[PDB]
Design a protein around this ligand. Structure first.
Ligand SMILES: CP(=O)(O)CC[C@H](N)C(=O)O
Ligand SMILES: CP(=O)(O)CC[C@H](N)C(=O)O
Lengths: 176, 176
């Protein structure tokens, strides 16, 4: 009942089940083509080489996942990280989401990142409240920055601060 | 006498001369490695395959350049584009920058983009005023997102709305 494990490439099929509808029918993800199970399988592997990738299991099945990712490419951005959480289309009011974050965030802090950023396609008052009750501060919005499903969607950014200012290179999740 | 030209890889050298010290000792660019002339020569070629790359020439020399680049990776971001302008560290109080934007922006609009974004490392009253008097809206700031030269830097984003809501795929600057 909502236990959080480190993900694995074998969990690709159940992560795709969650992600496929989001891509086809929502503007939650700004992708337009559904990645295959094998494609999701390479993503998980690639991510785990440097970043945490978590899954939330319930009754022995994956009902949610969360992974971190590079914020930007330039060197001076290395203490910044993107965070991404998708719960399965129904077991929300989450819950699963807050928990996935309750594990992902402290692990991020340990590795040395100073800030975490979440992209939230607007409107999504449910997703917004979640982040804001975790401590995320809204720091900006890119209006009409994207076009999907015959509509112009804004993208807002929420920052989670870890603090600090001594500056040493962010270590990676033990290179899986 | 302040003339705006479409860049070509032969301008690589003079582009670096402007850009190399900016990387070494400013927070304007978050690159840490100083790019060579060959590296810059490949960036110009690659950019010109899809995006406009401009230079400002006066007295037969480059005094400012400007280029467009992909804003984000995912498909629904395809009508959004990043903009970058660097002028010569002695020919500023520009001038040059305004003339670059006077050319770059309308090209972008005719290419089918709906919004252009400029990322400004803060503080910079010089660059901020420029964008504000051109029509850019401040849409947010990423606080302490970068660390370089023993200091944490905020990055601001300014948006230039081209308008429209009919949505046809952005065309490239007549590919090389
Ligand atoms: C709108 P987008 O595709 O940029 C980000 C999607 C999701 N919120 C995430 O955190 O990955
Ligand atoms: C403020 P800046 O000039 O470093 C922008 C960096 C670039 N967006 C990135 O991909 O890191």
């Amino acid at each position: 009942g909502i236990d959080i494990r480190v993900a694995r490439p074998e969990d690709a099929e159940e992560i795709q089940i969650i992600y496929a509808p989001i891509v086809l029918n929502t503007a939650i993800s700004f992708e337009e083509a559904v990645p295959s199970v094998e494609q999701m399988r390479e993503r998980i592997s690639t991510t785990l080489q440097t970043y945490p990738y978590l899954v939330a299991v319930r009754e022995g099945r994956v009902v949610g996942y969360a992974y971190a990712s590079q914020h930007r490419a330039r060197a001076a951005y290395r203490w910044a990280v993107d965070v991404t959480v998708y719960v399965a289309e129904g077991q929300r009011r989450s819950g699963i989401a807050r928990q996935l974050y309750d594990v992902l965030l402290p692990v991020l802090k340990r590795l040395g990142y100073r800030s975490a950023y979440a992209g939230i396609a607007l409107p999504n008052e449910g997703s917004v409240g979640l982040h804001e009750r975790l401590g995320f501060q809204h720091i900006g919005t890119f209006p009409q920055v994207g076009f999907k499903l015959d509509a112009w969607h804004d993208v807002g950014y929420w920052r989670f601060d870890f603090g600090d200012e001594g500056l040493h290179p962010e270590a990676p999740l033990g290179f899986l």
